Design a protein around this nucleic acid. Sequence first.
DNA 1: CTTTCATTAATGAAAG
DNA 2: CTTTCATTAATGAAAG
Lengths: 255, 255
Amino acid sequence: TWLSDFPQAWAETGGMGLAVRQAPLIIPLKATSTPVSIKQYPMSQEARLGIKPHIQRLLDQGILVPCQSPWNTPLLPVKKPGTNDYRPVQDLREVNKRVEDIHPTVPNPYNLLSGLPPSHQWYTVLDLKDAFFCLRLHPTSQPLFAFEWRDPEMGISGQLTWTRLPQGFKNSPTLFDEALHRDLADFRIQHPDLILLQYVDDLLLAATSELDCQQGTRALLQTLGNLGYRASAKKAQICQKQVKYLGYLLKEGQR
Amino acid sequence: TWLSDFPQAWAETGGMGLAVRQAPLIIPLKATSTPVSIKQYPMSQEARLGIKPHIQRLLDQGILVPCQSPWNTPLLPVKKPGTNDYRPVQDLREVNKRVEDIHPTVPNPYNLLSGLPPSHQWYTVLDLKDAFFCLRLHPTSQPLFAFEWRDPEMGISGQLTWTRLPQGFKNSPTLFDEALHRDLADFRIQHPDLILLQYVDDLLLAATSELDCQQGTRALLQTLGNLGYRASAKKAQICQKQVKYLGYLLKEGQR
DNA sequence: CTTTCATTAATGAAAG
DNA sequence: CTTTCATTAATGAAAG
């Protein structure tokens, strides 16, 4: 039972994450950038009702806060099913165009896997839950991601924005990847024989024996939980000799 | 009066040309070629009536002869005006595809002109009339260019074909250019100081003085007429210091 | 809903 | 009139 031995590490038990060792992020704008305020496209009541619960939860979690800002981007009503359960999707393309570019450091999967020796065949795969939301956004960079939220009868005054790294921001993957690398630097040092692959929120721990993987996984989950990250208990693939990672089937050190 | 001093050289006085020194041409087919017989698209009486006179003249001139051949290509009703005066245009693309390719030796105008010294500034431009028709076609290669000719009430039995190099045949320009080069080789030798440019049927004689151009032009016209070629008396540009050639305005050795 | 890049489908020009 | 290459105009896929 891992779900029990590591309360903090699992999203199902530790609650929403928060990377306590990471300074709130400041997002640099391009030299000539000026605020852009895109109007919110009218939203059908159905779309709005499907989205409402997610927005209320984020507000409850403090991931969204009311605000008044010169920046504004459209929120989009996106449903994966045939016509059920919506989810908010923000179009941040106009903001992305105004944010200074950074060097893409996230390695492509193929290259990331090459760094996997045939020796280590005991794998553990972890999927960090709501990775981006774990990184705080400095108050100065928060107004940048504002959007309008209407609640007819009575609700929010108008705009809401993120206090965490959001979905849709071009630099989120890279910023998260680098942040987690900084938080796990020590762990890599205390476990020289282990092999840890990081692909944004997708982690692969590789050990030589089942015992090392056991203790390796315990130490990792332990560290992640203490750092404020949360792994998905449901998706977790523990000490298997065969696992699914980045769209690959790892078996006998193949692929 | 040149129109008078050189009866044979002008199309207007010497009649249809015939390159007497040139052996009738044999057209080699590609190794795998087999005869293709494309049906004649129905022709409106108007188109047919507009074309008839040209066909009768060619038959009278012996440029077209009746024939029975496994080859056949469509004749096209083409009128340049708004809707008047037609002219026969044969679609020889299927025949062209079956004829063995030869090396394109006709030089592009730009390069042909480069070979023009600033010294020679007295020009004579000649346009050979019905150049292709001046080259005979060997009887063996004649069936290849057959087409159908209908004359309702009563006329030709069915097919007609050319006894001369025809329009529409991909190799005509090159074959004509090389043939005329062979016929004018001696003339170039007897007139070392003259500069003769050949672009298929467009000729440019360049001399140093007006007198050389006078005698140069007389000798050329004389030779052309004796060889069986015919220059256009109407278009002829004699011993001018400025002339139009290949879409260029030659003046003071410019362009 | 808008934006940007692909892939496919129409027309227009050149020719024999 | 049919063929082949261009240029332009429609749609379809990917995304935020």
